[PDB]
Every structure is written in structure tokens, then in C-alpha cells.
């Protein structure tokens, strides 16, 4: 169950110069597409797209590299082998660990401001700790869906393999009104609904 | 077009961190190579147990990238990039419930180069404990982002600051939190 690499091709305020590399594998419908990027500072100057089948000088700073690598069938055939080699291999390692990692969302409904139940207020649905990022967060007022006045922060990555989202509705609560936040996610077998009663 | 994006991202530069080799699955970092310790560090224990990564792969890629850096310092006639200042956001991991342990996240985003100083402040005082951090995480725009963490217990008579330092900043930037 080992991770495989592709060796980047060899080329050739305080003082600082940076070189960045990117080896991206895009898995879709049993296929793999590979993108090798050579970036000087923030300038991607030369790249290899498996869909192109050859190196291309993204900027003119990569013209010597595009020229040289494309003149070398050994380097071209090695880079072309990447989608079916390391991309495929690495993708096929990850069983229900990364490809099927599921973390259930924790849901909390709380109004933004405290006070009398008649005025303008924001009702917050703080959906937390889920994985993957794809989530559906709906707002309901007395069983009917509220589409208008829904202020969303959009998907927030916590950088710890969990996400969060704050979906809030602009509400003018009347006494006895039932506000329901409904979350749908792959980790959930049924929707998770959290209620707020007007008070 | 992709169901998933598995990517190896690496950088090499003159200032600290002098290099970084990492692997990310769907924008989240799975593992990286501690270049000094010459060993793989996994993000979650369940990764280290399920998989392996020979750290030599990381070191080999960094050596090539250092060669590539040198060639480009020359080719570009020592072109140093503009220092892109960071956008800093502070937000809790969990909803704030006074008395219940939570984690404060500091997201230092959209900066270049990956040369940064970050400190957590509780009531204007430096916090040394319950602190963790991400690597200099890659962005599709070849800029960087980083996450700093602080385990804290929310109390109304406490405030927090994320004091960040970057070259693109005229002075340290403090992002305040409740």
C-alpha cells in the first residue's frame, strides 16, 4: 500500500527566489489525467498535460524547456506513462479511507442577537465537522422552504480534514413560529433537522 | 473535470522553510516529508497505518527542485517576486459555548513568499501551549495559505489575536477575535 512518485524533470526586503512544482492527478470515470507544473516564484512557465501528450511553455521563460523535453522521446514516454502508472497506482491504494472517508456533520441552530421575538434577526445554522465538503443546508419556516434571505458563508475548510458552513436566514419571528435547518450529506442516511421555536 | 484531485505540491526557496514536499488529496494535505528528520509525517494516524511513503522520494524531488531553482535564478536574471500580503481570518472550529473546549483557527491566506511569523495572543499575551499549525499550503494561483490552531475554552472575559508577520506587510497584522 505504497505511494509512488514522479521525479520532476531537471532544468539545466530580503533576497528570496522560489521554485514550485505541482504533480496533479485528476481521477474521473476510471481515467487519470496528469498535470506537471514548473513554477518560478508564482509564474508557471512550463507544464506537461497528459491530454496534450507533450511539454508546453506556459510563458516564454519555459521555451528552452518545452524545446528540450519535446526533443527527448525518453522523457516524453516517461511523462506519458504517469496517468496509468503513479496516478492510477496512488488512486487505487485509497479504499474506504480517503476515497470513502465520511464524517458526520454536527448541526447547531442559534439566533445572531438575543431579545424580543418581533424585530429583524438572523437565525444561524452552524453545520460543523463534516467530510466530504459537499453539503446541502436548507431553511424551513413552518414546513415550507425559505429560499429568500438565506446568507451563506459558503464552504469553509478547517484544514484538519473537516469542513464547516454557516447558513443563516433573515427572519422576523412571530410567537410560535417553527424554524427548521435541514442538512443532507453523504455521511448521513437521512436528513439531520435542527429546530428553533420562536419563544 | 475530476471526481478527485490527488496532487504532489512542492517548493524550494532561499528563506525558511528552505523547502517543502507534500501530497494532498482534494485540497487537504495527507502527508509531507520532514526534510530535516528525513521521514514522512502523516496528517491523521489512519493514513500512516493504511499507507506508506518512502521519504527518499520527497528528498529526491526537493534536490531536483533546488537544481531547478538555481537554473531559474540565472535565467530570470535574479528576478525576485513581489511580496503578496496575507488575508487573515479568525474563526472557531465549533460553535462558541462558554465553558466548552473549542479550537480557534487562524487562516493566513493569499500570501507569497511562504515566509511568515505567526503568534497567538490571549489578552495581549503570547500563547505557547495548545498551539498547532499547517504547512505552507499550496494554492492553484501559486500563492500560499496556512492554518494556525489554538485550543481554548471560551469565556466572555477573554479576547484573542492572531499576530501575523509577512514581508508584504508594512507592520505586523493582528486579527482580533471575541
Amino acid at each position: 500500500q505504497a505511494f509512488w512518485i514522479d521525479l520532476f524533470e531537471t532544468i539545466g526586503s530580503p533576497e528570496n527566489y522560489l521554485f514550485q512544482g505541482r504533480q496533479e492527478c485528476y481521477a474521473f470515470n476510471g481515467t487519470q489525467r496528469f498535470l506537471e507544473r514548473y513554477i518560478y516564484n508564482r509564474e508557471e512557465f512550463v507544464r506537461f498535460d497528459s491530454d496534450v501528450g507533450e511539454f508546453r511553455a506556459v510563458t516564454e521563460l519555459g521555451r528552452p524547456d518545452e524545446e528540450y523535453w519535446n526533443s527527448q522521446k525518453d522523457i516524453l514516454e516517461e511523462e506519458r506513462a504517469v496517468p496509468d502508472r503513479m496516478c492510477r497506482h496512488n488512486y487505487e491504494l485509497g479504499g474506504p479511507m480517503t476515497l470513502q472517508r465520511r464524517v458526520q456533520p454536527r448541526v447547531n441552530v442559534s439566533p445572531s442577537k438575543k431579545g424580543p421575538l418581533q424585530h429583524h434577526n438572523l437565525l444561524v445554522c452552524h453545520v460543523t465537522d463534516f467530510y466530504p465538503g459537499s453539503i446541502q443546508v436548507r431553511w424551513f419556516l413552518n414546513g415550507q422552504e425559505e429560499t429568500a434571505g438565506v446568507v451563506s458563508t459558503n464552504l469553509i475548510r478547517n484544514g484538519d480534514w473537516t469542513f464547516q458552513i454557516l447558513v443563516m436566514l433573515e427572519m422576523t419571528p412571530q410567537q410560535g413560529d417553527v424554524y427548521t435547518c435541514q442538512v443532507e450529506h453523504t455521511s448521513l442516511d437521512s436528513p439531520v433537522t435542527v429546530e428553533w421555536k420562536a419563544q | 473535470k475530476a471526481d478527485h484531485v490527488s496532487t504532489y505540491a512542492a517548493f524550494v526557496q532561499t528563506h525558511r522553510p528552505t523547502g517543502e514536499f507534500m501530497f494532498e488529496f482534494d485540497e487537504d494535505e495527507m502527508f509531507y516529508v520532514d526534510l530535516d528528520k528525513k521521514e514522512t509525517v502523516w496528517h491523521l494516524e489512519e493514513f500512516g497505518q493504511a499507507f506508506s511513503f518512502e521519504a527518499q522520494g520527497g528528498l529526491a524531488n526537493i534536490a531536483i527542485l533546488n537544481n531547478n531553482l538555481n537554473t531559474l535564478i540565472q535565467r530570470s536574471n535574479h528576478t525576485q517576486a513581489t511580496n503578496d500580503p496575507p488575508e487573515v481570518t479568525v474563526f472557531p472550529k465549533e460553535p462558541v459555548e462558554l465553558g466548552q473546549p473549542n479550537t480557534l483557527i487562524c487562516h493566513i491566506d493569499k500570501f507569497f513568499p511562504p515566509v511568515l511569523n505567526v503568534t497567538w495572543l490571549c489578552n495581549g499575551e503570547l500563547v505557547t501551549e495548545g498551539v498547532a499549525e499547517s504547512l505552507f499550503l499550496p494554492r492553484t494561483d501559486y500563492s500560499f495559505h496556512k492554518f494556525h490552531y489554538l485550543t481554548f475554552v471560551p469565556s466572555a472575559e477573554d479576547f484573542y489575536d492572531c499576530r501575523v508577520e509577512h514581508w508584504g506587510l508594512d507592520q505586523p497584522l493582528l486579527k482580533h477575535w471575541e
Partner: T-cell receptor
Amino acid sequence: GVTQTPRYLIKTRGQQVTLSCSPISGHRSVSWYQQTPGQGLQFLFEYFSETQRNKGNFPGRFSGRQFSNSRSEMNVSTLELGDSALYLCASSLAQGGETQYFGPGTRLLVLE
Amino acid sequence: NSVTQMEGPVTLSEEAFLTINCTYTATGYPSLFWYVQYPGEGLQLLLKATKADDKGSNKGFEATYRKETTSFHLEKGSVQVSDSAVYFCALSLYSGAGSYQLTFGKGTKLSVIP
């Protein structure tokens, strides 16, 4: 392209040999093989950027090195009669080292 | 992880049909090769195939990467006297740090009789 020196060698059991390899410009992957009628092609070791990436199953007396210019040298100490073989050297431009370019070899004969 | 190829020294008349059998047994992703060793020199790449169904073609020789039979059988329609050499079948498997190691079969000598 791939050059190997010396072309032919006669040694007595117990002596030592150093075999040089000049890979093609600018191949950095250098592999060494022992060719025998008895065992065929037997992998010795492979070098890339001075480091020994892989090693075959040969005793410690069979050692190798690679210089900054990618040239390689292999050494066989405490020579045995059974070390008599063709010491092939192969370079590769592709850094993975699959597409190999073989040298003419060093024909080594070990005698009593 | 081995390469099993056609035994002993094959001897054929000029213009004959050649088949040098080669079967592999390896860890899911190998690339397949045919190396040729002409009398007196070192090996030389003749043909290669990356993935299953890929065909290697050079000097009128052809071998198909066949996953079904796990084989890379070398074929030539009409052999030339110049083809007298020793043919090696080979595997390419990942050997760490983005490197690959060749695994050769025990060579097949071919004598083409004019």
C-alpha cells in the same frame, strides 16, 4: 555513446578491480550488470545524482560510486574465479532509469 | 517478479517467421521491453510497450503487451541475417523514489542462416 574502460582485463584471484563508465550526455541514471553464461544478466546497482538508488544481491566486495558529472565506477575486491564475466554499464536519460543505453562492457577474467 | 522467455538457441533460415516467446509474472503495473544484443556489443532497446494492448514496433519486429496471456511474444515476419543476435525480454517495475528497475529474462540466441 556509453563508454566503458578498460575493455578487457586479466586478474589473479584475490586482487581488486575498478571499472569506469562514462554515460551519454546528459544521462544521470547509471546501472551496472554482471553478464555470465551461467546466470545471464544480474543487476549490481544503480546510481542517480551520486546516490545508489538500488542494489542487487551481490556481496559487499561489489561496490560502486557515481561522481557529480554522472561518471560511475564499480569495484570488486577479493576477486574470485566466478567473478569472471562481462560488466555491463547502462545509462538512462529518463530519470526513472527504464530506457537504458548499454556500454560495450568490461570483459573480466579472473585466474589462479 | 520474473521474466520467463523462450529457451535455447533458435536457428532459422533467412526470410523465416520468428517467434520468441516471453511471459511475465509481476506486480500489477509493469512496462514491457525487448532488448537486442548483437554479437560483441552490449544490449540495445529494440521495442517497448507501456500498458496492456500497446504494441512495440521496430526493425520489422513486433510484440504486443497481452494482459490476458501475461506475455510480450516477439514476432518477425521475415528475419534477415542481420537479426542474428541475442534477444532479451524485460520488465520495468517501480523501485522507489520515482525509479524503476529492469528485470531481464534469460537471453535467447538467434542464428539466422542465409
